[PDB]
Structure formats: structure tokens, C-alpha cells
Design an enzyme around this catalytic site. Structure first.
Site, short mmCIF file in Angstrom:
data_model
loop_
_atom_site.label_atom_id
_atom_site.label_comp_id
_atom_site.label_asym_id
_atom_site.label_seq_id
_atom_site.Cartn_x
_atom_site.Cartn_y
_atom_site.Cartn_z
N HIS A 43 21.94 6.53 -17.03
CA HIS A 43 20.87 6.95 -16.13
C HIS A 43 20.26 8.27 -16.57
CE1 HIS A 43 21.57 3.66 -13.42
NE2 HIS A 43 22.82 4.03 -13.19
N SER A 68 22.04 -5.51 -21.43
CA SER A 68 20.60 -5.27 -21.56
C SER A 68 20.28 -4.14 -22.55
CB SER A 68 19.97 -4.99 -20.20
OG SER A 68 20.45 -3.76 -19.66
N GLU A 119 0.82 -1.20 0.00
CA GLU A 119 0.00 0.00 0.00
C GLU A 119 0.87 1.26 0.00
OE1 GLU A 119 -0.28 -2.60 1.93
OE2 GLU A 119 -2.35 -3.24 2.20
#
Ligand SMILES: N[C@@H](CCS)C(=O)O
Ligand SMILES: [Zn+2]
Length: 709
Positions: free
Chosen positions: A652, A404, A16
Site C-alpha cells: 500500500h 496481481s 454525483e
């Protein structure tokens, strides 16, 4: 027996916390609705504590990071954010375009935000500890505010771009900082607060006597307040100084280390103080033998017990984990169960409970009986180098990538719910781009650890074992519960196909043994090195199969090589001995096989001599952010001869670096080191990037290479 607990996870049994944060950021709930989501979590946490222990912490529900919270508390808001406007500013500080730096919290996989100290003057900007104290008090629930201590706060912060860790850097700032803590505590006490949980993990770092002189001064200033001081993650080296602090209650971590116990046995413990014994592990999920812990508590002579380090390094609850290997669940205990352990330990120690729970040979032998020659390759680098360079026939300044590639919504969807198609297309693009060494893209992998953890024996994965990494990002750590072995090939299908589409070399792509361990839970009753070797051998099985299938280059990703190191430098030699051996077992490849070690951490300065012992042929580093300066450790190493893969591109950032921006890094690198050593690549994998950014950047590094040649 007074029971403490601290650091219960904030994320909730159904994450949550994550949903609240991400809904608020997306703007589909209001600020008021967000505060209500948080209040629910507050009550949830406190209810868990109330059922199990005597001292209920508050001020633990941080909306992004507790070190950031401490910075806000003392008015350390950098000029670029302007006036502090509440949640909006908080989150901009946390996750905005100009957010504080994020880094690992001690030797853990929780990441905190590094405060930037711009002024030498601290002031009380916000009093969250009082706010949370009153929130619960108004409900008729007394709590003890959980705060980061002044020494640790400064130790975690930066000033003028560098750590504030020399004693002569900290002195003046501490005087001003303590003034603000004094104000916070006075307010708490004036409102009837009986106990405050002060966290000083930095006490376990490599400190000097001058540090302890400053710490004594700090705590003499706060001696009037009801403080209980906590330390964890390692032993406190200056035991005598620590137990001499003017505090009434002192906690030690007696799980992560042996020295706290030895020191207390040697020097004793002051009669004017109460020891809180950190005896239940907050970092591993194993049920403990409570009879043994009880004996330890008695030996320590402790009147109080608690977890050893924060519980937030564990998942919330084991309850619904019903698809674990046979016998496993019965041996596990996550955060909620750890609270129940403290409860039972208190009961047992108080004589209120009498019944306590009880709690691959061939692979084991192979590790215990490894030949002394197992940790070296057949031929040394110089000889390997010649053989490899002849086999590959690569131009000067060869270009490659780290593994990747970007993931289209389709790719993410499919995996959640083809690979051969994506691989083909990716290999096609690389060729057409002009890259020298190719990769398969890792489209089939969720992440570099989980992918392998799911394919190894001796390792389990959970359904809902979520743990907070930072902000709203959680992950499920694997559990290495038994002997690790590799029954079947893990990656052959993907790499083989990849190689069959081109005459250019395609990299085998594997994750190292240290990194797999660093992101997983593992057993405490086995030496770390044995686990590492088991994993390493399993990885080597895959290496053999790869080179057997004709794969010429194999990369082993070891991003956690330094992160996994002990907090104390005195413990580094023993750690790196096994870390090196484990890597070398994994990388034990034929001389004609070129091994790449990918290590994208920020600096190599203090460990270059260990790096030098690794059996790789090429090492790829992240050089873009330092503008090549990271190369210092390598050029300064008389006798360096191995190839370096120079990261010229910050993966990034969405920006496409210019040829010139890349050039500056490569040229800084060629100040000293021979050109034949140098490869050109991105800082790291591209899985978090978009194709629109990746393709032009790749064309740019190819072009820079051709230019350098
Ligand atoms: N092969 C991985 C390494 C990340 S440290 C990747 O390219 O994403
Ligand atoms: Zn990396």
C-alpha cells in the site's frame, strides 16, 4: 404508525457524490461549486425521505466519513494536522499522506476513519448538526439530526495506539465527551428541533455490566433532550439495561438477529417508552412479505417502524436495472424501494391500503447430501508435505508473489474496452528476476469477486448498483439469487498458457467462498452455510480442472475470513464451523497439489485454532506493518507445522523497502518457527502499484532470500 428511515445512500443515482469529491480534489471545481453539488444531494436525499416517511433525518451527507465528522465536532483533531482550516484539513485527515486509519465499520463493507484521542478534553469545535438542521429548517422542512452516540464514538476510537474499550478506559473520557453532546443538543432544541436520531450500534457488541453502568450515566445526563436511540447489526445482549435507559424512544434491529425479539417477549418492553421496530432489512435487497412484517410489528406491539440498519449498505435504486436474469428484478428492492416499502407498511398498518405484493435441484441435493468425508483431503499435511516438496523441488526460503501485478494504462483501457501478451511478458520478467513460484498477474480481472461472480450460475451483477465502500470509492455487489454452480471453466485459459511458458510452477489463482459471500448480497431464506457450500463446490470444480491441466500449486484468496465473522464472540463457533467447511470443500485437492491460503488481514490471535482446521498447505500473511509480530499467534501455537508465506513488503506504499527492512521481518519470524516453513512474498497483490516500484522490490526480496539461504 410513525415511519422512520435512516442511512439513505448519499452517492446519488449517477454517483454525483463521487464526481463532486474527485472534481474538487483534482481542483476542476471550486469550493463553492463543491458545496453546491453537496446541497443538491442534500435535497435529493431529503426529497426521498419526504415522499415516504414521517421523520426526515439530516446531518447524513458526510463529505468522507461520519465518524470523522463526529471527531471534528468534538475537537478531536490530532496535533499533526495543526489548526482546523475546514475542508482542506478535513480531506487531509481523510485521504492525505498522514490520514487517520481506515477500518471496517462493524461487520459491514463500509469503512470508517478511526479517531485518535490525544487529549482527555473535548470541546465543541464545529456544530454540523445545527448547520444541517438550519439548512433544511430555512426551507420549511423539519428534520431530525442523525448523530453517532458518545458511547459508540469512543468505542470506535483509539488512544495511545489501542482501542478505548475497557470500561476503565472510557469513564473519564465519557464525562468530557457528554458535555459537548449536551451543548450540541441544547443548541438544536433552542432552535426548535423536535427529535434527534442518536446512533449507538456499539450497544450490540460484547459489553460488560460496567459498560452499561457508564452508558446509564451518559444518558441520564442527556435525559432532558428529545433523543431516539438506534441499535443495529446484532442484538443488544443486556436487553434489560438497554430498555432501562432514560430515553423516550428506543429502536431495535429485529432482522439481523433473533435475540432482540426473544428478549422483548421474555422481559416485555417498558410502558414509559416507545419502541421503534427495525423490521425492513437495510443490508439485503430482497422485497419483503409485508403481511408477515405487519404481523411482526403487531406482535412487537410497536407504534413505529423503520429499516433495521442503515440503508447505505444498499444501492440507490433498482429502477433502471433492466438486464437482470428473468424474474429477478421483480424480487429485488434497493434503497429507494425500501423507503417505499416502509411507506406501504405504514399505509397497510393504518388500514389505508389493502393490496400488497405477493413476493438447481441436482446441485442442491449434492450439498444437502455431502459425504462426511467431503471436508477432508485424502492425505494429511505431513504426508502431503513430503509428496509436494518432492514434486516442486523448491529451495529454502522460496520467493513468490500473491497474484496481481501493476496495471499499465493500456491494461486498464483494454479491459474497459492481448492478455496472452501481458502474461508472457510478466512471466518473462519473473523468471529474469529470479522468483521461485510464479503468477499470471490477473490482468484480465476487474476484482477478485466480480471476476468470478460474472462466471457463476445463481449469481447476478448489476449495471448501476453502486454502494459506497469509503470516501469516493464505490463498488457493485453481486447478487447471489439462486443455486450457485460453475457451468464452464473460469480461469483455465490464463493459467494453462502461463504454465506453458516456464518450467517454474505457476499458481492457480482463486477466490474463496467466504469472501465471495462477504462482498455480495445473498438470499435470506436459505442457510448461509448452504450458500457457502454451493459456492465452495463450484470453486472445487475449478480446482480439479486446474490440477488436471497440470497445475501444481493453487491459491485460494480468503481476505474476508475474519471480517465475515459475527459481531458477538458467542456466535463465532457456529460461524467458523461453516467457514472452515466451506474453505475445505473448495480446497479439497489431490495430495500432490499444494494449496495456498492467502489471508492478508491484520491478526490471527483469536482464531488460530480455526485456521488450524483449514486444509491449506501454505498460508500467506501480511507481516510488514507489524514487523513480523503478527507471527505471534503462529509461534504460540503448539503443534503448528504448516508453511507460512511471510509478507515483507507493504504493497500500500510506493516505497521500495531495503533488503534490511525486509530482513527484519523474516528474522522476527525465525525466532521460534523452523526455517523450512518460511516463504518470502509481498504482503498482498500488486495491482495498485507501479512497475517502477514493483521490479526493484521484487529484486530485493529475491536477494534477501539468496542471502538467507
Ligand atoms: N490474488 C489477489 C489477492 C488480494 S486479497 C491479488 O494478488 O490481488
Ligand atoms: Zn490480500
Amino acid at each position: 404508525t410513525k415511519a422512520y428511515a435512516f442511512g439513505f445512500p448519499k452517492i446519488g443515482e449517477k454517483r454525483e457524490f463521487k464526481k463532486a469529491l474527485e472534481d474538487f480534489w483534482k481542483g476542476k471545481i471550486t469550493e463553492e461549486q463543491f458545496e453546491e453539488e453537496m446541497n443538491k444531494l442534500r435535497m435529493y436525499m431529503v426529497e426521498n425521505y419526504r415522499k415516504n416517511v414521517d421523520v426526515i433525518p439530516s446531518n447524513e451527507l458526510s463529505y468522507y466519513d461520519f465518524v470523522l465528522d463526529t471527531a471534528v465536532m468534538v475537537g478531536a483533531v490530532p496535533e499533526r494536522f495543526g489548526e482546523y482550516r475546514g475542508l482542506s484539513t478535513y480531506f487531509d485527515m481523510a485521504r492525505g499522506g498522514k490520514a487517520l486509519e481506515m477500518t471496517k465499520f462493524f461487520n459491514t463493507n463500509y469503512h470508517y476513519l478511526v479517531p485518535e484521542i490525544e487529549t482527555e478534553e473535548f470541546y465543541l469545535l464545529e456544530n454540523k448538526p445545527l448547520e444541517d438542521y438550519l439548512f433544511f429548517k430555512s426551507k420549511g422542512i423539519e428534520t431530525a439530526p442523525w448523530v453517532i452516540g458518545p458511547f459508540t464514538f469512543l468505542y470506535l476510537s483509539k488512544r495511545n495506539g489501542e482501542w478505548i474499550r475497557r470500561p476503565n478506559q472510557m469513564e473519564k473520557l465519557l464525562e468530557s465527551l457528554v458535555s459537548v453532546y449536551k451543548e450540541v443538543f441544547e443548541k438544536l432544541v433552542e432552535n426548535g428541533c423536535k427529535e434527534i436520531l442518536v446512533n449507538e450500534p456499539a450497544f450490540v457488541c460484547d459489553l460488560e455490566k460496567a459498560h452499561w453502568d457508564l452508558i446509564l450515566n451518559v444518558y441520564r445526563e442527556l435525559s432532558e433532550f428529545p433523543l431516539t436511540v438506534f441499535t443495529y447489526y446484532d442484538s443488544v445482549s443486556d436487553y434489560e439495561a438497554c430498555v432501562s435507559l432514560p430515553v423516550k424512544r428506543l429502536h431495535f434491529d429485529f432482522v439481523s438477529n433473533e435475540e432482540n425479539l426473544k428478549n422483548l417477549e421474555k422481559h416485555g418492553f417498558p410502558e414509559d417508552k416507545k419502541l421503534v421496530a427495525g423490521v425492513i432489512n437495510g443490508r439485503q435487497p430482497w422485497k419483503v412479505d409485508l403481511r408477515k412484517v405487519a404481523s411482526l410489528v403487531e406482535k412487537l406491539g410497536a407504534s413505529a417502524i423503520s429499516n433495521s440498519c442503515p440503508l447505505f449498505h444498499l444501492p440507490v435504486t433498482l429502477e433502471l436495472e433492466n438486464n437482470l436474469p428473468g424474474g429477478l428484478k421483480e424480487k429485488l428492492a434497493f434503497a429507494k424501494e425500501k423507503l417505499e416499502e416502509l411507506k406501504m407498511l405504514k399505509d397497510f398498518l393504518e388500514g389505508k391500503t389493502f393490496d400488497l405484493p405477493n413476493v438447481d435441484l441436482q446441485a442442491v441435493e449434492r450439498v444437502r447430501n455431502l459425504p462426511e468425508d467431503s471436508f477432508r483431503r485424502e492425505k494429511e499435511y505431513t504426508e502431503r508435505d513430503r509428496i509436494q516438496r518432492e514434486r516442486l523441488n523448491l529451495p529454502l526460503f522460496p520467493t513468490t508473489t500473491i497474484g496481481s501485478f501493476p496495471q499499465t494504462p493500456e491494461v486498464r483501457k483494454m479491459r474497459s474496452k492481448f492478455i496472452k501478451e501481458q502474461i508472457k511478458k510478466a512471466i518473462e520478467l519473473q523468471e529474469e528476476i529470479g522468483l521461485d513460484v510464479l503468477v499470471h498477474g490477473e490482468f484480465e480481472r476487474t476484482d477478485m469477486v466480480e471476476f468470478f461472480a460474472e462466471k457463476l450460475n445463481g449469481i447476478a451483477t448489476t449495471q448501476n448498483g453502486w454502494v459506497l465502500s469509503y470516501g469516493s470509492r464505490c463498488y457493485r455487489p453481486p447478487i447471489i439469487y439462486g443455486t450457485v454452480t460453475r457451468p464452464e471453466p473460469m480461469t483455465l485459459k490464463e493459467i494453462t498458457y502461463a504454465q506453458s511458458l516456464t518450467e517454474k510452477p505457476v499458481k492457480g489463482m482463486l477466490t474463496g467462498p467466504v469472501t465471495i459471500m462477504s462482498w455480495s448480497y445473498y438470499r435470506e431464506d436459505i442457510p448461509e452455510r448452504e450458500i457457502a457450500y454451493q459456492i465452495a463446490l463450484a470453486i472445487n470444480e475449478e480446482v480439479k480442472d486446474l490440477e488436471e491441466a497440470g497445475i501444481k500449486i493453487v491459491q485460494i484468496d480468503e481476505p474476508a475470513f475474519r471480517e465475515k465473522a459475527p459481531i458477538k464472540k458467542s456466535k463465532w463457533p457456529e460461524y467458523f464451523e461453516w467457514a472452515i467447511n466451506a474453505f475445505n470443500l473448495a480446497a479439497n485437492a489431490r495430495p500432490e497439489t499444494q494449496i495456498h491460503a492467502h489471508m492478508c488481514y491484520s491478526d490471527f490471535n483469536e482464531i488460530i485454532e480455526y485456521i488450524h482446521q483449514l486444509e491449506f498447505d501454505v498460508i500467506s500473511i501480511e507481516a510488514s506493518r507489524s514487523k513480523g509480530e503478527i507471527i505471534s499467534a503462529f509461534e504460540n501455537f503448539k503443534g503448528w507445522i504448516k508453511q507460512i508465506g511471510v509478507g515483507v513488503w507493504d504493497i500500500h506504499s510506493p516505497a521500495v523497502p531495503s533488503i534490511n527492512e525486509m530482513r527484519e521481518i523474516v528474522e522476527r519470524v525465525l525466532r521460534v518457527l523452523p526455517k523450512e516453513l518460511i516463504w518470502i512474498n509481498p504482503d498482498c497483490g500488486l495491482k495498485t502499484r507501479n512497475w517502477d516500484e514493483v521490479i526493484p522490490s521484487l529484486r530485493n526480496m529475491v536477494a534477501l532470500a539468496k542471502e538467507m539461504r
